[PDB]
Amino acid sequence: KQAEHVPPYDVVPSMRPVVLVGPSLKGYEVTDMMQKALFDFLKHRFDGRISITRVTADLSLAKRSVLNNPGKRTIIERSSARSSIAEVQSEIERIFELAKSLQLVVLDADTINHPAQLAKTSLAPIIVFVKVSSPKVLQRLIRSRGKSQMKHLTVQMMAYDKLVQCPPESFDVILDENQLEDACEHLAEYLEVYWRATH
Amino acid sequence: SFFVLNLVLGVLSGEFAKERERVENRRAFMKLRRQQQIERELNGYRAWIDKAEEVMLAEE
Amino acid sequence: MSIFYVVYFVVFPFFFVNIFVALIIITFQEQGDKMMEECSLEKNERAC
């Protein structure tokens, strides 16, 4: 039974990092602005107790049983020497040590759009979903953004329906609220109890 | 004068109550209610966009 | 100057007074019963 040999114990960070997914593809004007408002509350509410970091590289391919050493050196001129796996594999230790300090770390990747893509990573952060109750407000909200956003609205709505099909269970917590204070209190209450849960 | 006015008001109010529950009227009111609900849910989300936008410019 | 009086009549005695009447009609609490769960299943068939 050595074809897979799934380990019973997997090394995981001391503190769960923070990932926010939804309501569509990241990296666009609407989704960057929609998700960014949550971070500012985290900085102000947990000032002196939170670390804020942004990662640009992909993270969905964070696997554990790829090979003994995929792309160990860049001088061998192998397939992985010129690939992007060298930097990605190096930064997975960066998040591991940041959470080792017993302090929360936020993740701001521009490649996560579904919990299924982060279901095979040993980092395994906290999946928080910001979703609208109805699809009818998305197109109207896109219209107010500008002319450029309307051109990409077809792909913008593509992920919204697909991300809905994901079991809420899959997400760690949900934010179906629509205002500031209720969402800020709901997020802070879970983490404040979680902060005391680790001490 | 007074009794006839009372009877007219009662009959008219009863007819208005009865006719407010017709299928077309119910459909129109449901359309208005869904419009209002969508607008109410959209107004709350707009606060997020402005609150975020103010902070980033403040922190440049 | 009869525009002023026509507009006034269209607004106050034709619209606002009927607004008062309608508001009193649609928000009239029952006086005789003053109860919450008299039948809890129907209201008119109690006499029937």
Binding site: - | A17, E21 | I26, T27, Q29, M36, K43
Partner: peptide, 26 residues
């Protein structure tokens, strides 16, 4: 609000109009 924590003074007009609606679809 009762779900956020988890995760009959009607007038005569209101009563009659509510009862008139549930008896209309049939």
């Amino acid at each position: 609000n009762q779900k956020h924590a988890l995760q009959h003074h009607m007038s005569v007009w209101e009563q009659r109009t509510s009862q008139l609606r549930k008896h209309m679809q049939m």
